[PDB]
Design a protein around this nucleic acid. Sequence first.
RNA 1: UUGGAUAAGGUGCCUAAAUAUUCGCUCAUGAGAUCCCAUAAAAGGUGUUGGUUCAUAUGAACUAGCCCUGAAAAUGGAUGGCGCUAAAGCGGA
RNA 2: UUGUUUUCACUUUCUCCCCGCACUAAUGUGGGGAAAACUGGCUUUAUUUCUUCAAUUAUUUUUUUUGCUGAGGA
Lengths: 128, 201, 147, 180, 35, 103, 185
Amino acid sequence: KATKEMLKIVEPYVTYGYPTLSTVRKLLYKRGYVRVGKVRRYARKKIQDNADISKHLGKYNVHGIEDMVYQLYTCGPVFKKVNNFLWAFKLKPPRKGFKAKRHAFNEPRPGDWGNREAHINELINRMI
Amino acid sequence: MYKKEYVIDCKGHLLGRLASLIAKELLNGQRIVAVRCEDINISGSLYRNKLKYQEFLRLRTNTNPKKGPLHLREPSKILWRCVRGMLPHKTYKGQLALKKLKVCVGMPYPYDKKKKYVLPSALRAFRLKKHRRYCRLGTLSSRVGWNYDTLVKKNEVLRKQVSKAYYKKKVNNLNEKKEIKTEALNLINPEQRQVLENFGY
Amino acid sequence: VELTEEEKLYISKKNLLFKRFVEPGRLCLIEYGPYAGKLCFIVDIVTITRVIVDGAFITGVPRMVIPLKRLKLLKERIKINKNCKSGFLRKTVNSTKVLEEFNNSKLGKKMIIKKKRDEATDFERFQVYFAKRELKKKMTTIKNKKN
Amino acid sequence: IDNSLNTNIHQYHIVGRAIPTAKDKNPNVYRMCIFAKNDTNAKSRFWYFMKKINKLKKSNGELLACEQIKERFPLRVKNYGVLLRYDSRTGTHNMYKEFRDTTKEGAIAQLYSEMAGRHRARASSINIIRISEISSSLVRRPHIKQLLKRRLRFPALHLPTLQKEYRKKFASKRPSTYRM
Amino acid sequence: KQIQKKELQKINHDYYKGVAKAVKKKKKREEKKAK
Amino acid sequence: LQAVRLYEKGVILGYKRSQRNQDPNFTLISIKNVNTKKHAQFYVGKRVAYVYRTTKHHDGVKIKCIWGKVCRTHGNSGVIRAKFKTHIPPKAFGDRVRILMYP
Amino acid sequence: KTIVSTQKVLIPEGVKVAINARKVTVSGKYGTLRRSFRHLPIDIRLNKLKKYIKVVMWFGVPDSLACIRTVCTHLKNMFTGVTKKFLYKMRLVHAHFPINSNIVDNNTRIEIRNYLGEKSVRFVKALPGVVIEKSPNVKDEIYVSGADIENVSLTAALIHQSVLCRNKDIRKFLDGIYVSEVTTV
RNA sequence: UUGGAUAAGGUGCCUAAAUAUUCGCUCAUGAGAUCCCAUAAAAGGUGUUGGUUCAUAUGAACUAGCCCUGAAAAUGGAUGGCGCUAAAGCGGA
RNA sequence: UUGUUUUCACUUUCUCCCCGCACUAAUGUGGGGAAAACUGGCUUUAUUUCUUCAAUUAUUUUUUUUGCUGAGGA
């Protein structure tokens, strides 16, 4: 309820949807960066190895990018920690472009903002 | 685009589309020669286009009309001005492109004896519905003050007769060459003959 | 209730301005789209601008809706039914040999020649050049003799 | 398959229901057929109509089903009569229109194009009610009545549409629109 | 999968029957309102 | 007769460009017989030679070449983008280049 | 937009019709007439053996379909004019000044004098294929006859409009030349 | 800085990119053509295109799209220009 | 007060008959009647390389031709 209500007041400036396992894995593998350093001194690093994941999240027994993928795809017990450990994804512009960032995805005219539901997957794939 | 020069028979072409294609060719560097510019067509009625040209004529620098927009009544000059308006003529490259164009009324001495091309994307027959009005550039020019239309017509009919004679001679020569080719196809080796027959020669 | 002998000659010499209608069974050639350059048969008409074409399994054009403007109607036409399906269309095409008679007209021969001409290898391109050279030699000798 | 030819209209069967409360233990569920670009748009339209017709909003409701309806015979031509309610710049009007094609989605796409071209009614102003296949004897619009003759044939007066490759700029001689 | 196809046709048949019944009911209501 | 060709002819259009802004790192090239994106994609790895004459001699010769390579297609009508070792001069717009069959 | 719409016109007995690319030539015992219809999208089928001509439009909108009957009426006007000359009988009406009509140039270039006593000659030519004479029965009558209805009616209109009154009450000064009757010979 | 891909907006020429595809509408003897934005109304039309409700394929009454009238200013003139009507205009896809 | 059940009306003809009997856009046609069943649909058995095995999504594995870049020196 809380995150959904927060998303409601930002809806015209975002587009979101349900990621599915394949796109979660692709996002983590080819665009997954991680906050490595001391607290508030994080220093974004690409994963490239399970050492940093084990070091920070191992106390929740999350040593592994596959463990991170699982905890993200299924909103598991260690979700806040994994999500916060993960640096914000810096996506490319869509390969074939947007339709109209001005208008909603649910408007009959071409548009982009709002909840795309399962249709976020193709957009992520073009943006990744 | 890749020729030394392209001669375009402007008969039956729409003025704006023809000018756009010509301007793009000139900017890309292809020299073109536009002939029979008096037979260019413009969409819209003759009266409507005459009204447009009267609007153009009423336009002049009242301080000194010599500096004003020179109006130009020949259809070839009208096409030239339209092409210039579709072109960055105030730069060096645009001026070179503009000077690469040559416009004529009728078909003068070198251009009546070379191949004339046609732009299908600007043909009236392909671009105007049959129930919609159009005008003839030579007629509009005569109404505006060109008064060389009939002389171009008689020169054109003379050129038509000369071209008809040339075409008859060419057809006879082609028929003779064809019969020679059939008679000689039996004298080459059978393998070469089958190669030619297989590839349609 | 007959027309004796005038009917054949008069109807044959009627010489209508418009032939090659959009009946079912009309053979057409697609000139735009992913199926451009392939033959097909009009099977029925959905709207003035849309038709259904089923190049029977011979041609490689599936039964599909196409706008009529993408089609070039040809002379040939078979006598299929209004509601005939792909199997009977193939049977009718094979029986009538309509495709074979299309590949004997000026357009069909031209298409076949162009296809196998652009499929030519470099060696047979040279073979064509060599044959044309020999033919030119022969033409030149006989033309000189003609004087 | 020609993506330049296909549209992006599909038909969706959607079933929804208000969340059960202490007032009523089991509310009556509602079902709809909606034409939209995708299932997400179809569900948005479903909740819009739920809120408009019933006093049921997406926040107090749940989705029991949403599945795409595919045409049983997507290669058989049939005639469709579609009722419609759209609002103009000065009022609201309901009109009945007719089409004929292979799919209800294609007929709806034709309807949207016709409404835009003839009445400048944007899709946001159109409500589709009651599209149904109709028999040839019940067809009402003459422009479709003329399409159902015993043997239908006409010429092909359209101008040729060639490929880009053969749409060459300079032609040796003037082409013919007559062709056929 | 024949039994699945049977129930699969049946569900869509019932759905279209419901749509047609609603259409018929609305048409009858409009006819009643006409008089 | 002599002087075999074995290259396709092209014309130097302007630079990679928007309205009122230029990117003279890529040059737009029109190839002779190609008019579609699909056909332009055929010549993608090919080397490009801009051969031009000169008023006087520089290595005993009056001719020199700027070398480049096709990079990708441009637009839908068979125009390509070419990257040269040095930016070709805008005086060369409309001139001829050789799209070579190698590599 | 109706798919096909045709109309049929029966060819009378003593005429010969040639139609090529909607350029029609109609020959009869009273001359020959020619008309171009190349400004209309029309498929014309002339049946010489069994007479009649059929004009058909494909995909005609009402604005264009309105021209089918126009073409048919023009064709039948050609037929009737070439079999029996169109005739416009015209009357010279006057209150105080009799209108003096003189026909010259083998029934062309009619010159009228004394219209409202103006003593100035008002002359009007006849269009090609049109002959103007004076009736042998009624003294104040003029015959405008010919094969082409357009030319004949235009000649009658020219005669009528060359004699309009100016600067007076038009409904009181009724003098002029008026088409009394349209018939055939 | 080097590549890539996009936003807004565009792809007839000026001007990089569609004389793209697909479906309708519109002929203007002062057509129309991107928010701000560079004016237009009441009232009309037997122009044409769809709809609605009444009367045995006819007569009416409405309705709303585009078009037209209403619509006059001073240096010569501006959908930015050329020009465009099987749009390069209008509403979509 | 929802289900359940019933009636007719729905197709092709390069078929036949009558009327207009050549009247059509037409190498046919308009109106009025019959015919089976080619066509179209369904029910069984064998096959899917004669032919088809699509499309979308989820989940996977490759592939053609190629642009740009090479920080560092443990």
